Amino acid sequence: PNFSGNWKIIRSENFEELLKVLGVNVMLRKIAVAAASKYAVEIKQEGDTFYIKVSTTVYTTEINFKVGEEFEEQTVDGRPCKSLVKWESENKMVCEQKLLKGEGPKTSWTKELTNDGELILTMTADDVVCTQVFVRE
Ligand SMILES: *C/C=C(C)/C=C/C=C(C)/C=C/C1=C(C)CCCC1(C)C
């Protein structure tokens, strides 16, 4: 698996519907969808250790994890969570998340490297799945 790379988004499906579940009001959802157009993911993978940097025009966040060990990050709408990533197959991993404080929809995400050289990210909140497709820069 070579997840490593500089990935740029080419398609984003159901993102607004995802943010709706997460309680984001309509004007901010529209502004967020527009911001997801200028949006890049940088991945460094060594074995089952990952470094992931997610960037938009004005904001950037870094994620560090090892497959199989709990780490802390944030949900899509920004609330801290405990996360755990496992492989589903050679080139797909799934992350389950647990809210640190409080309650909300069940969130998770997946990353997959296709045989065509695309990266596919899915983000889920309850029954809503957002799919985003990236290609290498
Ligand atoms: C493994 C890749 C992951 C976990 C990517 C997560 C991506 C996000 C949490 C993206 C969030 C965004 C917003 C909350 C609004 C602005 C646009 C995005 C897509 C960068």
Side-chain angles (χ1 to χ4, degrees):
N2 28 282
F3 277 92
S4 296
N6 300 293
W7 298 93
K8 57 161 174 192
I9 194 166
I10 60 163
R11 196 160 60 252
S12 179
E13 303 168 33
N14 265 251
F15 187 45
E16 172 175 8
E17 292 79 348
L18 177 81
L19 296 177
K20 187 176 186 189
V21 166
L22 305 178
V24 175
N25 281 337
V26 55
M27 190 198 293
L28 262 50
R29 306 205 290 265
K30 302 299 182 180
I31 294 175
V33 173
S37 297
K38 321 294 203 202
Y39 150 56
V41 175
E42 186 197 307
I43 302 185
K44 295 180 189 176
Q45 176 191 355
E46 221 136 36
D48 64 5
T49 300
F50 288 79
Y51 163 84
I52 301 169
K53 186 174 82 175
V54 174
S55 296
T56 58
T57 300
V58 302
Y59 199 86
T60 187
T61 324
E62 287 170 326
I63 294 160
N64 287 273
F65 68 83
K66 216 164 123 277
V67 177
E69 61 162 59
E70 198 181 46
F71 60 107
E72 177 172 322
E73 57 172 347
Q74 345 246 313
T75 60
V76 178
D77 66 303
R79 328 176 43 178
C81 60
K82 290 295 184 173
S83 287
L84 178 59
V85 171
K86 300 177 181 200
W87 299 103
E88 245 194 49
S89 61
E90 185 175 352
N91 286 313
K92 182 167 183 170
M93 72 199 74
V94 53
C95 179
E96 297 295 327
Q97 300 175 320
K98 265 217 64 200
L99 278 169
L100 269 182
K101 327 236 236 75
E103 266 151 1
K106 184 149 119 97
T107 61
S108 58
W109 59 257
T110 72
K111 282 196 183 68
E112 178 176 9
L113 219 189
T114 77
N115 297 316
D116 290 335
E118 291 184 342
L119 173 77
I120 305 179
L121 169 71
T122 77
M123 296 173 298
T124 301
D126 289 333
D127 9 65
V128 171
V129 179
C130 171
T131 303
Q132 295 176 327
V133 173
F134 300 76
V135 297
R136 301 174 177 279
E137 259 169 28

